[PDB]
Each structure stands twice: as C-alpha cells, then as structure tokens.
Design a binder for these strands. Structure first.
Ligand SMILES: Nc1ncnc2c1ncn2[C@@H]1O[C@H](CSCC[C@H](N)C(=O)O)[C@@H](O)[C@H]1O
Length: 225
RNA sequence: GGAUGUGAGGCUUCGGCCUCACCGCUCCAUGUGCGA
C-alpha cells in the first residue's frame, strides 16, 4: 500500500513501460566489464541483470532492503538467460546499506570497483536523514578500491515533498534536512567522504520527465593519497 | 629540428598554481650515404 523505502513492487512497469531502460544508453560497458560491482537498492533487479548478462562484470551484487524484491530479483534471472559467465556472476542480498554507527562505517573495507547508487539517495535521506545519507556516502567510499567509481543518480529536492507524509519519521527528517541534492557533489568530494573528482555523464531519456535524472561519476583516486 | 591537448573541482600575488579524471605515452620533418 505505502512504500516508504521506495520499495515499489511494480516499479519498472511504470519507470520503463514496455521499453528499454534509458540509463543503459548512458552507463558505459567498459565501466563494468571484468569489474566487481555493487548495485545499491537494486529493487527487482531488472537493471542489475541487464548489466550482468550483457556487460560481463566479474561479480555483480544486488542489494535491497526489501526481501520480497530480492526474491523477485532471483526469480527474474531466468528472463535474462541466453564463474564470470552469467548467471554465475550475479548474486542478490537483502539488507539495509545504512549502518547505524560511524565506527561501523569506518570499519568497511574495499570490495568493489564500481558502486551503483541509482534513485536511492531520496529514500535514504527521508528515512534516515542527513546522518543516514552521509553514512551511506562514506561507506560507499570505503567500499571502493582505489580507482573505483561511484555512479550516482540522485533525485531532485523538488521531488521529496510529495512523499514527506509517508511516516512521522520521514516527515520529521524532511524538515530537518540541510544537505540538499544540489550540495551532494561538494559533500562527496569533501574530506568527510574523499572522492577526488566527479563528472556529469548525461541525463538519460525517459517516458516521464520525472525519471530524467542526471547521472554522475565520482572517482576514488588511484593513489593511496 | 618541430609538436602536450581536454574536463571537473579548488586556489590565486591575475603570472599562474594544486588535486583528480581524461587523452596520449607518440606523430611529423629530415641523405651531398647505399644500388643486393
Ligand atoms: N537503506 C536501503 N538499503 C538498501 N536498499 C534500499 C534502502 N533504502 C531503499 N532501498 C531500496 O531502494 C530502491 C529504490 S527504487 C530504485 C531502484 C533501482 N536502483 C533503480 O534505479 O532502478 C527500492 O527498491 C528500495 O527498497
């Protein structure tokens, strides 16, 4: 009924109505081929699986907070069939990526070359506030190996307001937020996170203007310092 | 003998500088020698 995490169970039916995901013309295959990739908030995994079966990542992990979407994603694998060969290169896991303590975030070790954070920032922001959003951002940086990339597709602030009444906590967080999407790039490249450069890749096309969101690349430097 | 480009961010004493990411890590000029 209410989908307070953005955990829609019919999501791609209205994001990509009978059509290709326009982000696949913007994401580049060379970002993924032979790489270890984490897909945050993968939902029922349509985009996760398109990448895993076409662009040959050595490992693709789809993470979502909602176990019912993860079960669906596992059941969606069969629709993409013809160690590094799909479907052996993809796995799904249920979990909340937002850790509840800073020391848990600082314990994160690098495991991935690419982290996808697509259409997730709004939901983390509303449910866990600035603090939870910053914990996700810092954990992503620590999760990436040197040379890694964060692919960030953030929702605009103008789109938060219609969801603010989902729960009292979300409503509370909405009116407490001070780090707005327009400041994400500055925060991600600050010493609190540590990405060393970023670029706007493109804004994909979509049937709905509400899904035409900018896609950014945030780079973790190849040098140790 | 000639040729070092692009982007984002930050700084600047307006000369530039710094970090990262790209793009390359090569192309061009050139015999009054040689004739298997
Ligand atoms: N803290 C969290 N940890 C993991 N997944 C989360 C999360 N908060 C929200 N999500 C998931 O994020 C998804 C947002 S919808 C975006 C889906 C997908 N990334 C795409 O862009 O196509 C939902 O599936 C929701 O369940």
């Amino acid at each position: 009924r209410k989908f307070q995490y953005g955990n829609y169970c019919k999501y791609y039916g209205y994001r990509n109505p009978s059509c290709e995901d326009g982000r696949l013309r913007v994401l580049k295959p060379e970002w993924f081929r032979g790489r270890d990739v984490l897909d945050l908030g993968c939902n029922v995994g349509h985009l996760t699986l398109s990448i895993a079966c076409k662009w040959g990542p050595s490992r693709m992990v789809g993470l979502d907070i909602d176990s019912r979407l993860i079960h669906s994603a596992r059941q969606n694998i069969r629709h993409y069939l013809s160690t590094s060969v799909f479907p052996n290169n993809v796995v799904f896991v249920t979990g909340n990526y937002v850790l509840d303590r800073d020391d848990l975030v600082e314990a994160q070790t690098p495991e991935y070359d690419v982290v996808l954070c697509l259409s997730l920032t709004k939901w983390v922001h509303l449910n866990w506030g600035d603090e939870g959003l910053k914990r996700m951002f810092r954990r992503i940086y620590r999760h990436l190996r040197p040379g890694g990339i964060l692919v960030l597709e953030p929702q605009p602030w103008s789109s938060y307001g219609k969801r603010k009444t989902l729960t009292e906590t979300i409503y509370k967080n909405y009116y407490r937020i001070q780090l707005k999407p327009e400041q994400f790039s500055s925060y991600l490249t600050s010493p609190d996170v540590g990405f060393s450069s970023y670029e706007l890749v493109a804004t994909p096309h979509n049937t709905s203007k509400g899904f035409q969101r900018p896609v950014y690349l945030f780079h973790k430097a190849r040098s140790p310092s």
